[PDB]
DNA sequence: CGTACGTGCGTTTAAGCGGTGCTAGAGCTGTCTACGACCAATTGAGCGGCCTCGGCACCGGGATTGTGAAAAAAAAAAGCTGCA
């Protein structure tokens, strides 16, 4: 009767996602699975190239820039510029929210 | 068995050297504050747990698709000449 421990994943945000891009579309226990896989390595990936472009630069910050870097660095052409177009609107929207 | 490549010639080219002169820009300083750590207190987003009900796995049965043989038609190909 002890509570089960808590587990996270991304993957309430993936359905919510999911209802934009297909709203009449659901998904298996096991294509979550590998919808989480994919996001924590994406992200491992990022926090790891943008941590070494700061450490080489001699910085303390991970800031927007080198993240928008880390992403050129990592993704594919077309992805990468949507990527960034993406990045570039969220920052702008969060910082007119105050 | 055909000609694509390696060899080796003579001719041509610009890489490499060693040097000189100009300056963009790498990298350093010192200054100063906007921003991020940390903090505590506050609170609602996301967790586990639970219950439901409709998608999809499983089924049988018939429709449609794809292969292979067999017999048959078309096919190149094979032993025989003449005529020059
Ligand atoms: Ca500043
Ligand atoms: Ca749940
Ligand atoms: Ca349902």
């Given at each position: 009767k002890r509570k089960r421990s808590?587990?996270?994943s991304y993957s309430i945000y993936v359905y919510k996602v999911l209802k934009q891009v297909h709203p009449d579309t659901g998904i298996?226990?096991?294509?979550?699975?590998?919808?989480?896989?994919?996001?924590?390595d994406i992200f491992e990936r990022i926090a790891g190239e943008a941590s070494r472009l700061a450490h080489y630069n001699k910085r303390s910050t991970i800031?927007?820039?080198?993240?928008?870097?880390?992403?050129?660095l990592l993704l594919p052409?077309?992805?990468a510029?949507?990527?960034?177009?993406?990045?570039t609107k969220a920052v702008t929207k969060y910082?007119?929210?105050k």
């Open positions: 808590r587990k996270e298996s226990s096991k294509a979550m699975g590998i919808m989480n896989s994919f996001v924590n800031t927007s820039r080198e993240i928008q870097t880390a992403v050129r052409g077309e992805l510029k949507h990527a960034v177009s993406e990045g910082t007119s929210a």
